[PDB]
Amino acid sequence: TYKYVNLREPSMDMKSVTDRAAQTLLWTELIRGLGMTLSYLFREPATINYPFEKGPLSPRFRGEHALRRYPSGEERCIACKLCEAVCPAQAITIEAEPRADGSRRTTRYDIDMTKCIYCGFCQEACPVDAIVEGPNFEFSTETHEELLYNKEKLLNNGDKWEAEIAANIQADYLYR
């Protein structure tokens, strides 16, 4: 089923012809266009007062990465490398060995945040909720090197943001 957007016949009776003549000479449609912009001048603007106001985000928002822990403080990551395998950008680099207590843990866990596409595939693939994308989006830097995160940076992000990260996971994990 279809419709015509511009298949109309302009009436050629004197009343209609004079209506278009008055339009041409008196600029009626142009003045009508002025009315619309005038009505907007008196509308409340939609601007928000950043940084004192923030745009709304949901619990699923994909932001800065962080490595999480268990309630006891043990790291959740077990160096399974499923995150590294799935990363579409190859942004993750992992090395691992048996820890002094025999645990399976990483010795290297880097994310090149300038390779990362912030797709969230790593947090989907992780079997233990170790790597997440947190709610922070205000971590712009002055140098390139500051954006090449290693494990110490990523663990510090987790300790820094765990309060919010845990609440966000609590809100969304029943959809996963």
Binding site: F52, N136, T143, A163
Partner: protein, 145 residues
């Protein structure tokens, strides 16, 4: 004549900030003189306000503290100053402020939040976290040729 009742609302903002100095202080710090309900105040001095008659987006806001972690933030405020427990509320990821539903306490969670540290002596510097992989042979110290 609503003009007068509009103007009265204007004056009540001056008293709502505690006199002209308070009204001027928020006008020049935050470029806004609205009055909202105090929802709480974090340990760093940031005050969080709500006004549910404002359209979604402008109904929550923070008046940042004038000093955080030893830094003068009277004029230099920053979005990264908001701690995580309030970050969720301020960005509408939740309805409940931390004053009502506080976060789950953990041993390892930072007690002191830090804002963005780029460009300062505290900035992050990347490095390889792995140890040397190939060990070189060390020649003997006693002579023997």
């Amino acid at each position: 004549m609503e003009l007068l009742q509009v103007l009265k609302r204007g004056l009540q903002q001056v008293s709502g900030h505690g006199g002209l100095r308070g009204y001027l202080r928020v006008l020049f710090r935050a470029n806004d003189v609205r009055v909202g309900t105090l929802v709480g105040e974090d340990k760093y001095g940031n005050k969080y306000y709500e006004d549910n008659k404002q359209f979604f987006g402008r109904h929550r806001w923070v008046i940042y503290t004038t000093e955080m972690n030893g830094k003068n933030t009277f004029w230099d405020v920053d979005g990264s100053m908001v701690p995580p427990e309030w970050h969720r509320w301020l960005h509408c990821m939740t309805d409940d402020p931390p004053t009502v539903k506080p976060p789950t306490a953990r041993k390892f969670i930072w007690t002191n939040h830090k804002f963005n540290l780029s460009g300062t002596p505290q900035q992050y510097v990347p490095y390889s976290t792995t140890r040397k992989k190939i060990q070189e042979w060390v020649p003997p110290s006693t002579p023997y040729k």
